[PDB]
Amino acid sequence: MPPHGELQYLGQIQHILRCGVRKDTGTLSVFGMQARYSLRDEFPLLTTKRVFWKGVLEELLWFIKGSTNAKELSSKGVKIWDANGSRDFLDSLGFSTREEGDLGPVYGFQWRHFGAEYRDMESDYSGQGVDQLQRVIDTIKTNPDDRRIIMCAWNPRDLPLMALPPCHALCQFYVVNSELSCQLYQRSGDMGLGVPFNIASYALLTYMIAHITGLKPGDFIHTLGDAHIYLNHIEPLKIQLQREPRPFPKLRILRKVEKIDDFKAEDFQIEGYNPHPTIKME
Amino acid sequence: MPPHGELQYLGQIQHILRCGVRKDDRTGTGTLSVFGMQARYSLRDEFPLLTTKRVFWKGVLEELLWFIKGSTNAKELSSKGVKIWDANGSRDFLDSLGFSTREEGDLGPVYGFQWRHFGAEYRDMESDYSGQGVDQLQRVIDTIKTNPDDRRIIMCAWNPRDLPLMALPPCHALCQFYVVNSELSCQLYQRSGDMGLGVPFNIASYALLTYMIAHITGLKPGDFIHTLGDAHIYLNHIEPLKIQLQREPRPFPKLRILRKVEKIDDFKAEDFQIEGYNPHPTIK
Numbered sequence: 001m002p003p004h005g006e007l008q009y010l011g012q013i014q015h016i017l018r019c020g021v022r023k024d025t026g027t028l029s030v031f032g033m034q035a036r037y038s039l040r041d042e043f044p045l046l047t048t049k050r051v052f053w054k055g056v057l058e059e060l061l062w063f064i065k066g067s068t069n070a071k072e073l074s075s076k077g078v079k080i081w082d083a084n085g086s087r088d089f090l091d092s093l094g095f096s097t098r099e100e101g102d103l104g105p106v107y108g109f110q111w112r113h114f115g116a117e118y119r120d121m122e123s124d125y126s127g128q129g130v131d132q133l134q135r136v137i138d139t140i141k142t143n144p145d146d147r148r149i150i151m152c153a154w155n156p157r158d159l160p161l162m163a164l165p166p167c168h169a170l171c172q173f174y175v176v177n178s179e180l181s182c183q184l185y186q187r188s189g190d191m192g193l194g195v196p197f198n199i200a201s202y203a204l205l206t207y208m209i210a211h212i213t214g215l216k217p218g219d220f221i222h223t224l225g226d227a228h229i230y231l232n233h234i235e236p237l238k239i240q241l242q243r244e245p246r247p248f249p250k251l252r253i254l255r256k257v258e259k260i261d262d263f264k265a266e267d268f269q270i271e272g273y274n275p276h277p278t279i280k281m282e
Numbered sequence: 283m284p285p286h287g288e289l290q291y292l293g294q295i296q297h298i299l300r301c302g303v304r305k306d307d308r309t310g311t312g313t314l315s316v317f318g319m320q321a322r323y324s325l326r327d328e329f330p331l332l333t334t335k336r337v338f339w340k341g342v343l344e345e346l347l348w349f350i351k352g353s354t355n356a357k358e359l360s361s362k363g364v365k366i367w368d369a370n371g372s373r374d375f376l377d378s379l380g381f382s383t384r385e386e387g388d389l390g391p392v393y394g395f396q397w398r399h400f401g402a403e404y405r406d407m408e409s410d411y412s413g414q415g416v417d418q419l420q421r422v423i424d425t426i427k428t429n430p431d432d433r434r435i436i437m438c439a440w441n442p443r444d445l446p447l448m449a450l451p452p453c454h455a456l457c458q459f460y461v462v463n464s465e466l467s468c469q470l471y472q473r474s475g476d477m478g479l480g481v482p483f484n485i486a487s488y489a490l491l492t493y494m495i496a497h498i499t500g501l502k503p504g505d506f507i508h509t510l511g512d513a514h515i516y517l518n519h520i521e522p523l524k525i526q527l528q529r530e531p532r533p534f535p536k537l538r539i540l541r542k543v544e545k546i547d548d549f550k551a552e553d554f555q556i557e558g559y560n561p562h563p564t565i566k
């Protein structure tokens with residue numbers, strides 16, 4: 001039977017290890033990859049190593065809120081953007097004026113206020129720029145056949161203001177047979193560390209939008225540009241490739257929610273998540 | 283011997299015919315459709331101009347030089363013999379989008395304007411945009427020279443703020459570049475793909491663009507990666523495509539760049555020669 005689920009991911013690791021080139025403290029890398037994760041009665045949270053579910057869910061709610069304030073995610077116990085908002089790191093980018101935690105116009109601002117003028121992370125941007133996220137939901141409801149259902153985080157004008165240029169440049173949604181699918185264009189993928197988190201994020205987003213629009217989840221298609229393994233991750237990845245995948249968990253949404261801004265972390269339960277030990281890399 | 287690059291394109295047609303699902307559109311005539319496909323076409327001593335049906339090379343090349351010029355004027359392309367944008371700049375089509383006031387040929391802030399002036403305020407097709415917004419095309423060329431390992435070598439045409447002014451939202455949302463071993467590859471994210479009429483043309487445009495940037499930056503072409511969103515065949519085109527699928531590809535031609543060129547802006551159509559193109563007859 002053809003490789004499905006987790007074996008797509010593990011297949012991509014294997015391909016990089018065998019066919020990737022040394023491109024540099026260093027990586028093995030392949031340009032252009034594509035995996036398909038079914039979302040039908042399962043949720044692609046990897047089992048060969050524990051994924052930081054809690055980080056996935058809080059990061060996403062933080063984006064949905066429009067927030068560009070690393071402290072606002074750090075308050076929920078998720079520190080993954082904290083280094084990017086530090087005094088020293090902001091100072092190194094020429095942003096000595098800026099308050100600690102102001103990442104600039106990253107995902108949350110691009111998703112809700114694309115094209116508005118960024119001031120700081122505290123400003124009110126109500127009704128300013130394009131609310132791409134709501135515009136996606138509306139189009140799914142009133143014209144599911146549309147082929148322009150896109151949300152774009154890549155904004156060349158705003159790049160120089162951002163703490164980090166986005167890895168997730170864009171996503172597109174698609175509907176047929178009452179199933180909502182999503183494809184992510186990810187320009188750069190650290191396969192050991194980032195990508196399992198990244199798959200879970202966009203699968204989570206697709207579950208959320210499906211729920212709001214009365215559709216069932218379909219596929220998550222993960223497209224990569226620069227797909228790489230850091231050289232220090234090879235040996236641990238070699239341990240991991242030999243573990244037997246367990247079946248994917250399910251994601252249960254615990255109440256009927258009408259607008260995407262109303263989702264809360266306690267609305268979500270991951271069922272039957274049975275991962276092998278977090279055996280992870282630098 | 284490694285198989286012919288074109289078999290991926292014909293494979294994709296076949297997967298859609300076999301597994302694609304009925305999905306409609308504005309015209310209502312209908313498609314067979316799959317979401318998410320990817321093909322890889324080597325550009326090493328070969329040019330992926332499809333041979334199972336003749337592709338409108340002249341159209342490919344003039345449109346691209348038109349884009350590079352930063353033009354948003356259907357008439358400047360039409361004047362070179364290439365009518366592909368004309369219907370979209372006609373008084374009638376523009377009126378139908380509620381642009382009753384706009385000059386004929388003004389397509390709004392489409393590819394050329396996004397590539398050379400992203401984020402600038404669009405006025406009309408004749409205005410001067412020199413020094414306004416981001417010149418993505420040049421920033422891409424500059425980054426390829428000075429930092430080839432960079433993972434952010436991107437040129438985006440998808441501008442949500444400008445979408446309402448465009449005569450057509452772009453199919454080619456973005457493209458990304460990559461260098462390793464002095465080879466430049468390119469990946470295209472195409473949000474929507476008419477497999478019969480547009481995809482072959484599209485493969486050649488980005489292959490050609492990569493050849494251009496490689497020549498500017500002292501590199502050799504590597505791969506062109508074509509990634510699709512909604513990949514579809516119009517029901518219209520099923521009989522014609524079943525005809526095309528019967529044909530054996532001929533070997534891909536080669537693309538020759540006839541002089542040394544310093545800046546992307548200085549390419550002319552006469553600079554390019556397609557050697558050894560041996561296509562079967564045009565279809566429909």
Ligand SMILES: Nc1ccn([C@H]2C[C@H](O)[C@@H](COP(=O)(O)O)O2)c(=O)n1
Binds near residue numbers: 188
């Ligand atoms: N959500 C994220 C964020 C980051 N990265 C990885 C990819 C790169 O290794 C690095 C980002 O660096 P760069 O911008 O140079 O590609 O972290 C990732 O996979 N997923």
Ligand SMILES: Nc1ccn([C@H]2C[C@H](O)[C@@H](COP(=O)(O)O)O2)c(=O)n1
Binds near residue numbers: 451453454475484
């Ligand atoms: N460069 C282009 C332009 C257009 N199309 C096709 C895709 C769709 O069939 C239609 C545009 O439709 P839509 O905007 O609804 O996706 O033409 C294409 O393949 N390539």
